Design a protein around this motif. Structure first.
Motif, mmCIF file in Angstrom:
data_model
loop_
_atom_site.group_PDB
_atom_site.id
_atom_site.type_symbol
_atom_site.label_atom_id
_atom_site.label_comp_id
_atom_site.label_asym_id
_atom_site.label_seq_id
_atom_site.Cartn_x
_atom_site.Cartn_y
_atom_site.Cartn_z
ATOM 1 N N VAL A 1 0.833 -1.192 0.000
ATOM 2 C CA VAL A 1 0.000 0.000 0.000
ATOM 3 C C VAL A 1 0.871 1.245 0.000
ATOM 4 C CG1 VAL A 1 -0.200 0.073 2.509
ATOM 5 C CG2 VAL A 1 -1.948 1.116 1.104
ATOM 6 N N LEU A 2 0.443 2.246 -0.756
ATOM 7 C CA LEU A 2 1.126 3.530 -0.879
ATOM 8 C C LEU A 2 0.273 4.573 -0.175
ATOM 9 C CD1 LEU A 2 3.428 5.228 -2.261
ATOM 10 C CD2 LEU A 2 1.860 5.490 -4.151
ATOM 11 N N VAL A 3 0.688 4.950 1.029
ATOM 12 C CA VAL A 3 -0.089 5.876 1.845
ATOM 13 C C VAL A 3 0.051 7.275 1.255
ATOM 14 C CG1 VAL A 3 -0.402 6.875 4.091
ATOM 15 C CG2 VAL A 3 0.122 4.468 3.893
ATOM 16 N N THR A 4 -1.010 7.747 0.608
ATOM 17 C CA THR A 4 -1.036 9.085 0.040
ATOM 18 C C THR A 4 -1.408 10.144 1.061
ATOM 19 O OG1 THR A 4 -3.343 8.817 -0.615
ATOM 20 C CG2 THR A 4 -1.668 8.182 -2.179
ATOM 21 N N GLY A 5 -2.152 9.771 2.095
ATOM 22 C CA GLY A 5 -2.780 10.722 2.974
ATOM 23 C C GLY A 5 -4.136 11.186 2.507
ATOM 24 N N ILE A 6 -4.436 11.019 1.222
ATOM 25 C CA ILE A 6 -5.785 11.247 0.734
ATOM 26 C C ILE A 6 -6.666 10.104 1.203
ATOM 27 C CG2 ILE A 6 -7.212 11.531 -1.287
ATOM 28 C CD1 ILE A 6 -4.521 12.586 -2.626
ATOM 29 N N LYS A 7 -7.905 10.427 1.528
ATOM 30 C CA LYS A 7 -8.761 9.581 2.341
ATOM 31 C C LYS A 7 -9.638 8.635 1.533
ATOM 32 C CE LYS A 7 -11.678 11.897 4.672
ATOM 33 N NZ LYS A 7 -12.400 12.728 5.628
ATOM 34 N N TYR B 1 -3.630 2.677 -3.438
ATOM 35 C CA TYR B 1 -2.549 2.633 -4.400
ATOM 36 C C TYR B 1 -1.534 1.571 -4.026
ATOM 37 C CZ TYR B 1 -4.052 7.239 -6.174
ATOM 38 O OH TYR B 1 -4.766 8.259 -6.757
ATOM 39 N N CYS B 2 -0.710 1.213 -5.005
ATOM 40 C CA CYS B 2 0.278 0.157 -4.874
ATOM 41 C C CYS B 2 1.643 0.727 -5.208
ATOM 42 C CB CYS B 2 -0.055 -1.022 -5.792
ATOM 43 S SG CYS B 2 1.080 -2.419 -5.714
ATOM 44 N N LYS B 3 2.612 0.482 -4.334
ATOM 45 C CA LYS B 3 3.991 0.824 -4.640
ATOM 46 C C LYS B 3 4.470 0.039 -5.849
ATOM 47 C CE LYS B 3 5.477 2.026 -0.005
ATOM 48 N NZ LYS B 3 6.326 1.577 1.125
ATOM 49 N N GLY B 4 4.984 0.749 -6.841
ATOM 50 C CA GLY B 4 5.431 0.127 -8.056
ATOM 51 C C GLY B 4 4.338 -0.152 -9.051
ATOM 52 N N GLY B 5 3.087 0.103 -8.688
ATOM 53 C CA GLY B 5 1.975 -0.093 -9.587
ATOM 54 C C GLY B 5 1.625 1.181 -10.313
#
Ligand SMILES: Nc1ncnc2c1ncn2[C@@H]1O[C@H](COP(=O)(O)OP(=O)(O)OP(=O)(O)O)[C@@H](O)[C@H]1O
Ligand SMILES: Nc1ncnc2c1ncn2[C@@H]1O[C@H](COP(=O)(O)OP(=O)(O)OP(=O)(O)O)[C@@H](O)[C@H]1O
Ligand SMILES: Nc1ncnc2c1ncn2[C@@H]1O[C@H](COP(=O)(O)OP(=O)(O)O)[C@@H](O)[C@H]1O
Ligand SMILES: [Mg+2]
Ligand SMILES: [Mg+2]
Ligand SMILES: [Mg+2]
Lengths: 487, 170, 529, 52, 50, 140, 364
Positions: free
Chosen positions: G129-135, G143-147
């Motif tokens: 998981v790619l923590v954007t901070g958007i809710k 989102y996916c790291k590397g995706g």
């Protein structure tokens, strides 16, 4: 004496262009390419000319391993197809070549595939009803012997199943002959039909058969799938004209004949018309539909299936088929999803011999009263969905229930649907089919519940079913009591 | 020298089946026997009851399905799949000999419960087992009874008193 | 010894396609045959004939080493159709549609063949257990059958087919190698990473021994994406002709139609409806009529086909979709309104049918599916009603809803493990429990035998632990004298022990911690079961 | 080209696959000694075959 | 009032989609006619240049 | 004419196969002019011209009650009125199944007889009111 | 050695035909005319062959004041662009030429812009998981790291703003070199971004810069917009392969990449597909997408924006773009008109990592 030879110019898909030095043959003439080069006899058929030296053409067999400049032989005649009693109980291709491995065909004569339509004098319209055994048809769309029928419907509605049932009921009782034409049908349905006709002994090889079967299927190229219905008519018009017999001509289906030529029209260079169809669709269909007609000599009682893509009637292929029929049977997804089969919409379909004089007066009045009732029924779903049933008069609720009972009653199980329904089919006679609607029309059966009409035949079967449902209701009532007694 | 057989399309059919049954008996791994059914059927010789029972014999008496081992081998399931291919697909129906081969395996496999299913199914079809196998089934049952092996152990242990996605094992 | 025959030189090249200029006049090229293009002294670029012209020029589809193509390169001709290697040696591999293996970390078969004629194929008699209860009960898939998978993007189209491939494995390790159904997964125009994850999934569950994968990614040439599904069916040829069974999974065929459009339009074919050439119906027809259940004369082999077609805004009015519904027997329509609405697989039963029916599925499944059809036809008429008569609810409104819970899965379900969950519904043993606990019930019914635990063992044999009763159920059926009473005397005890020990404790929970714990448990039960 | 292809085929870094393993078919005496434990031990065996 | 507010949007999108469907069918036909023009060849044009 | 909608298909066939430039619904441009070549030949001639007359009853089939179609649009633009039959009324025992609001005769009274003007003029003043009442009243 | 020379044949827009006497070079070869004649340098890539002794080729700069008998020069290679740490904190054109007026880029090697995609063996999809901070982005479409990511939205819905928020959250605390491809979007935004980063010391020119900027904007002709995404991928693939380092790939946006190739296909004379796109759209877009993958060597976490004209998903460009992505983020206008921002439509959105195997069970 010698047959002239022509050399190929170009090959684009199924379309081929051929040179002819001396002179080009007539249109629709057949053209063989010997099997030495491509392994199979590649027959071809002229569709149009381009020049006094050149003419392009279609191929009903796949053009593969075909060189340029190959010799192309002028047979001197269009596609000759065999006719006779020996065509019975055999599967045939477009060329008349028997694809079943039963042996050769005996043929004293071999007629061509294209012929002129019967002149207006030759035709003959005799108002005589056909008994299908089906319960919707025998009332609203009483099929006329010697006439043309169309099972319009999309995918997944039962038009093919209706054809199977009509074979089961009519073709057995038909002392004449029968013909089936698979046009873009599935290759599996051919097996099911052949095995049924063999099990039913319509096709009795050691004995005598009364069913020709022609098959040009989805696997075949367009030039084959287009020239099938004409093949079946070479078979049928012999039995009509020469033998004088009555004939059945089932077709599954007329729409694949249309798009087979649509797939080629772009290659021919003809500008496409609207939705993606050829400009010559109506004419091309008329040249075939007019061949299907009774005469002084005999009567072809054809039945046709049509694919309505996306369930859009406005598609010009069905719309052009309207004129060429007498019973425009129509099927709808909405009735099918409700559990009602055959999924006929009685309001969207109407026959020709639904007259006062051609048929019985009670039949006519009962049918038109039911049509008149279902109209109001639609107008009242449009209200009950909004207000509620309580906002209607008792006289209005009455016809709601009656139309709701006629809609479920006009359902019927078929012997062919034993797999899906899980119940044996019922043959409903015409006379019995009027004293049961008319009874329901004048409140003679309002005490009978609704579901008792669902998926049964006549009115006698109903009271059997209703008596049951009373018993299977009393069971749960008294079992609820004994459940209360136990705990 | 027998009633000629026919396919569903009424075509005449071969019956000279012996030369294929011998290839079954000469087999050593009971997957080649099925392949013999295949090469037999391609030659317009469909299998008969004698051939299927030859295959069930070769199954019961062979060591492994293929030369190399295979995970998930079940000596019973192949035999009981042939009977579905027999009854339903091909229309042939088994006999006392067929179910006999079947029951011998459940004796060898020690599964005493499936045996009793077979014991009941036989007589519901008129077939009668050999008591040599019925008594061995009951013997395996009594042994597993006294030993606590009447059921596996993982069923005879308490469940999580508290609901938790991990405790139940999912 | 072996002198290659040349026919012309490369005249033009437009991306994936080319135009040849013939060298001599008396030279003649065939149609659909493979040509070779000497991109270098070492390597060769395969190709295919798609047009021939009055000028002698040749419209060519390229398939390999396109970047090394120029104008003026010598062009050779094999005079043979496109072929690929075939055999059992290909199982357990990913393979270019030209037969070339894609690394990871004798015989030849024609790519385009005629189909089994109307005498060379048997009707559908035997099933193909996709593992899902809706598809095994209400939409029975069989062998020699071709059933579409429709759906909007991200709904489960790929996963139904993968789960079929994963269900067949356990059986195939038990049954002989003649009745085992192998598989082929064709990825047309997909992303190469999706293919990798599929390979690893099958390799985890060991379903790769009995699966090959025909990859034609998005970067691959359109001609290769075009001839991929033919390569798959070309492998199915041998398993038909070798009397075996085989399964096809054509990932998006729409992506196989874009490729044919690309080819035809760039080769200056006339467009048609939605810019397709017009004969794109015949394309899938050629592909899909090759599916059949072959006659016993031809080995009683088969190949099932699970084509997939992407859908936009849940319409079935697009050209290619209608062209395929026309062809395929049935269809498994997956509705995003239901996928989004919670249930997975999102099968919509009103629009999903199967034109084979009972004849495909099993004796033990006929009697349950025929009951579920009646029950769901009756529940279809009532379930629109927000339940008002909570205690006056009809039995159909109960059984139907519990059956919908049972329809919720993630992976395939074993046949023995599916019926016994549906039998309880149709016969009403699972009516006192509530909807939300319909699957935990099933879990215990299938993986934690209660009467074996609580000592209530009067059944002689019938228990769900053995897992070998599937074959007895399959043969004898559930509505049989030897199996019916023992079945009831397993389920009624399961219900009573559940309703007394487990259900009772569940309804006594009030805290948020414990209720959230119980919450997540049931979702896990919905996945694993 | 033959040499190039042969070099590409081999993967020295990788480990060659071991012979296929049959079903355990544990004896009744083992199970009678250890009723409830053999499942845990088979799971740990899979864990060790993967990691250790 | 609300039903009318829905009815205008329905009538509007109905006519929008109607017109776009018309335009699309036209461009199909024109695409085909144009492709055929590309298919047709040029002649020779032989005449005295001197 | 039974009917003109097929006549236009024929003109389409001819014009497209002879490579005339297409247009809406694949028809050419002068297909409006096609029916204007025809219907305008209908007339009520002058007393210098024998006072003869040619009346026309051109039939045009609709599909799903569409009138936005090209040919229907055209013939309505040409004709001196129209008649509109409906299937929803044909099925409800109303035969001939007109829809009197959509059906129009711009020749309102000049055709009618002395005995007919009064009668039909009352029927207009009866049915225009019958609809305002019948439309608002319930089903019951 | 001696350089090949060819001579122009015809001009229709940015597309040009060239007559090569001896023989034609391979496709994608670049072709240069000196700036003496046209006034500016003009590089022109081959895209197809018409016959022997001819090549059709698209121009990057404008064809203004171009004649029909101009000497064209075969460079002998594709369009090469620089790579390395010297590409950091610099703005680049389609041709790889720097435009920020700073100084000569100190490259060591140049790589071509066109490249074969990675092999199946090289791909390694790790789900994180790619923590954007958007809710919304976390719950619904994590989102996916590397995706890959897709911001599918019409004009005035807020995809560009989501990108800016992700930059402030993700890119600054990424610890890996980022790339920003502007493809047919506002030049205004590129100015604001260069200043938003030059103030945040991401483009510290006297120190270490963690960013690369590439801008082929809407003013540029289709020849540039059609080949600028490739130019950013070269810059990122160097850091993926050689450096073996995680990177970000913000594309704004690929719909104009598609438009440019369509505007070209019209000039080339190829028969168009439906709504007016090129027949080769899916291929041209896949050759770009499949280059954006996470190999064993590194990872590229892309954020691709997409435009939907007339608010139509059935437009073939987005419709094709869905199948190439891991996380679809479908924005709406009616949601934006209701005051909600980001105007996400969660029912239409989707994700791949949204399984309990990757994200914890409660979040699912
Ligand atoms: N029965 C199911 N249970 C749980 N999750 C499911 C189920 N079916 C599908 N999914 C999930 O839905 C997502 C997409 O499934 P799938 O890959 O089949 O989509 P798709 O139909 O191929 O759409 P696309 O081709 O656009 O990817 C995955 O995350 C998958 O795990
Ligand atoms: N989170 C937000 N809060 C307030 N306003 C927003 C938000 N997101 C977007 N907007 C507003 O929406 C408008 C457009 O934002 P943006 O620049 O992202 O448009 P876009 O999606 O790029 O569309 P286009 O590319 O056609 O301009 C601006 O007025 C912006 O302020
Ligand atoms: N009489 C019927 N009773 C029950 N189901 C039917 C009946 N007729 C059709 N169906 C359903 O419709 C499906 C398709 O029938 P079919 O005739 O193949 O459709 P089509 O004619 O459109 O090809 C069947 O598979 C069945 O599920
Ligand atoms: Mg049908
Ligand atoms: Mg998918
Ligand atoms: Mg923007």
């Amino acid at each position: 004496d010698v047959k002239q030879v022509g050399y190929v110019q170009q090959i684009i898909g199924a379309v081929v262009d051929v040179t002819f030095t001396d002179s080009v043959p007539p249109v629709l003439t057949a053209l063989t390419v010997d099997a030495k080069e491509t392994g199979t006899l590649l027959t071809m058929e002229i569709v149009q000319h381009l020049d006094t030296k050149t003419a392009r053409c279609i191929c009903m067999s796949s053009t593969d391993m075909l060189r340029l400049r190959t010799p192309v032989v002028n047979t001197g005649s269009q596609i000759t197809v065999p006719v006779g009693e020996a065509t019975l109980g055999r599967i045939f291709n477009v060329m008349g070549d028997a694809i079943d491995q039963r042996g050769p065909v005996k043929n004293k004569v071999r007629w061509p595939i294209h012929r002129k339509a019967p002149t207006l004098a030759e035709q003959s319209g005799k108002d005589e009803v056909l008994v299908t055994g089906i319960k919707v048809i025998d009332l609203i769309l009483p099929y006329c012997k010697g006439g043309k029928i169309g099972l319009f419907g999309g995918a997944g509605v039962g038009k093919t199943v209706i054809i199977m049932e009509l074979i089961n009921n009519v073709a057995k009782g038909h002392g004449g002959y029968s013909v089936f034409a698979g046009v873009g049908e599935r290759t599996r349905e051919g097996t099911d039909l052949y095995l049924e006709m063999m099990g039913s002994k319509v096709i009795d090889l050691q004995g005598d058969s009364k069913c020709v079967l022609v098959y040009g299927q989805m696997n075949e190229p367009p030039g084959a799938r287009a020239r099938v219905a004409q093949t079946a008519l070479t078979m049928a018009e012999y039995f009509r004209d020469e033998a004088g017999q009555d004939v059945l001509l089932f077709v599954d289906n007329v729409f694949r004949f249309t798009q087979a030529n649509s797939e080629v029209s772009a290659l021919l260079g003809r500008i496409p018309a609207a939705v993606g169809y050829q400009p010559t669709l109506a004419e091309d269909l008329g040249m075939l539909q007019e061949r299907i007609t009774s005469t002084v000599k005999g009567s072809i009682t054809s039945v046709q299936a049509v694919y309505v893509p996306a369930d859009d009637i406005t598609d010009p292929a069905p719309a052009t088929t309207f004129s060429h029929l007498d019973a425009t049977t129509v099927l709808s997804r909405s009735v099918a999803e409700a559990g009602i089969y055959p999924a006929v919409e009685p309001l969207e379909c109407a026959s020709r011999i639904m007259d006062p004089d051609a048929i019985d007066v009670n039949h006519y009045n009962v049918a038109m009263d039911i049509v008149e009732m279902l109209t109001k029924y639609k107008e009242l779903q449009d209200i009950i969905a909004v207000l509620g049933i309580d906002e209607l008069s008792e006289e209005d609720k009455l016809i709601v229930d009656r139309a709701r009972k006629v809609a479920k009653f006009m359902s019927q199980p078929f012997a062919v649907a034993e797999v899906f329904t899980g119940m044996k089919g019922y043959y409903v006679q015409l006379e019995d089919c009027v004293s049961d609607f008319g009874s329901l029309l004048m409140g003679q059966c309002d005490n009978i519940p609704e579901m008792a009409f669902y998926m049964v035949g006549g009115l006698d079967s109903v009271k059997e079913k209703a008596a049951k449902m009373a018993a299977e209701a009393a069971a749960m009532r008294e079992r609820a009591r004994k459940a209360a007694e136990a705990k | 020298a027998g009633g000629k057989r026919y396919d569903l399309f009424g075509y005449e059919v071969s019956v000279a089946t012996g030369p294929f049954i011998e290839e079954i008996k000469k087999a050593q791994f009971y997957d080649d026997a099925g392949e013999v059914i295949v090469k037999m059927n391609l030659a317009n010789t469909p299998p008969d009851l004698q051939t299927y029972n030859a295959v069930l014999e070769r199954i019961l008496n062979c060591k492994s399905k293929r030369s190399q081992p295979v995970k998930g081998e079940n000596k019973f399931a192949a035999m009981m799949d042939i009977l579905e291919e027999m009854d339903a697909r091909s229309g042939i129906k088994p006999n006392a000999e067929s179910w006999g081969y079947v029951l011998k395996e459940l004796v060898q496999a020690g599964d005493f419960r499936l045996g009793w299913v077979c014991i009941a199914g036989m007589k519901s079809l008129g077939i009668t087992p050999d008591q040599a196998l019925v008594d061995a089934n009951e013997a395996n049952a009594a042994k597993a009874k006294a030993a606590g092996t009447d059921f596996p152990a993982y069923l005879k242990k308490a469940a999580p008193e508290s609901f938790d996605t991990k405790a139940w094992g999912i | 010894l072996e002198a290659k025959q040349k026919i012309g030189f490369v005249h033009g090249i437009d991306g994936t396609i080319a135009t040849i200029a013939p060298a001599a006049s008396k030279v003649t090229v065939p149609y659909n045959t493979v040509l070779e293009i000497a991109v270098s002294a070492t390597n060769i670029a395969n190709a295919l004939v798609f047009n021939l012209e009055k000028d002698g020029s040749i419209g060519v589809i390229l398939l390999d080493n396109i970047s090394e193509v120029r104008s003026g390169q010598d062009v050779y001709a094999t005079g043979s159709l496109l072929k690929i290697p075939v055999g059992f040696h290909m199982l357990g591999k990913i393979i270019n549609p030209l037969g070339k293996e894609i690394p990871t970390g004798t015989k030849l078969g024609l790519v385009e063949e005629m189909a089994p004629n109307i005498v060379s194929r048997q009707p559908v008699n035997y099933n193909l257990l996709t593992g899902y209860k809706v598809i095994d009960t209400l939409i029975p898939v069989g062998r020699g059958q071709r059933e579409l998978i429709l759906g909007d993007r991200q709904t489960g189209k790929t996963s139904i087919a993968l789960s079929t491939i994963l269900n067949q494995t356990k059986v195939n390790n038990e049954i002989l190698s003649k009745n085992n159904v192998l598989s082929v997964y064709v990825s047309i125009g997909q992303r190469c990473s999706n293919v990798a994850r599929i390979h690893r999934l099958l390799t985890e569950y060991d379903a790769m021994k009995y699966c090959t994968i025909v990859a034609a990614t998005a970067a691959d040439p359109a001609g290769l994406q075009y001839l991929a599904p033919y390569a798959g069916t070309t492998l199915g040829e041998e398993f038909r002709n070798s009397g075996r069974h085989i399964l096809l999974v054509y990932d998006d065929l729409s992506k196989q139609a874009v490729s044919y459009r690309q080819i035809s339009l760039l080769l200056r074919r006339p467009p048609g409806r939605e810019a397709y050439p017009g004969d794109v119906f015949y394309l899938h027809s050629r592909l899909l009529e090759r599916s059949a259940m072959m006659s016993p004369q031809k080995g009683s082999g088969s190949l099932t086909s699970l084509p997939i077609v992407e859908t936009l805004s849940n319409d079935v009015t697009a050209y290619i979709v209608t062209n395929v519904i026309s062809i395929t027997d049935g269809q498994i329509y997956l509705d995003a309104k239901l996928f989004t609405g919670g249930q997975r697989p999102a099968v919509n039963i009103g629009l999903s049918v199967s034109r084979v029916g009972s004849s495909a599925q099993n004796k033990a499944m006929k009697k349950v599916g025929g009951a579920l059809k009646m029950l769901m036809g009756e529940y279809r008429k009532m379930a629109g009603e927000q339940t008002s008569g909570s205690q006056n609810v009809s039995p159909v409104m109960i059984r139907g809803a519990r059956c919908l819970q049972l329809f919720n899965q993630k992976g395939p379900s074993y046949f023995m493990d599916a019926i016994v969950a549906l039998y309880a519904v149709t016969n009403g043993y699972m009516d006192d429990v509530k909807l939300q606990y319909s699957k935990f019930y099933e879990f215990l019914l299938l993986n934690k035998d209660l009467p074996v635990l609580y000592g209530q063992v009067n059944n002689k044999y019938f228990y769900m632990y053995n897992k070998n009763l599937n074959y007895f159920i399959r043969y004898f059926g559930l509505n049989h004298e030897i199996l019916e009473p023992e079945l009831k005397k397993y389920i009624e005890i399961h219900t009573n022990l559940f309703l007394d020990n487990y259900q009772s404790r569940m309804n006594e929970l009030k805290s948020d911690e414990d209720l959230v714990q119980l919450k997540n448990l049931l979702y896990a039960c919905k996945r694993t079961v | 080209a033959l040499a190039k292809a042969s070099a590409a085929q081999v993967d020295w870094t990788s480990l060659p696959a071991a012979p296929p393993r049959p079903s355990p078919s544990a004896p009744d005496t083992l199970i009678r000694l250890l009723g409830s434990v053999v499942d845990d031990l088979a799971d740990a065996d899979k864990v060790e075959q993967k990691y250790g | 009032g609300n039903i009318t507010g829905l009815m205008q949007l329905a009538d509007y999108t109905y006519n929008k989609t109607r017109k776009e469907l018309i335009t699309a069918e036209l461009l199909e036909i024109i695409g085909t006619m144009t492709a055929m023009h590309a298919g047709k060849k040029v002649g020779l044009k032989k005449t005295e240049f001197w």
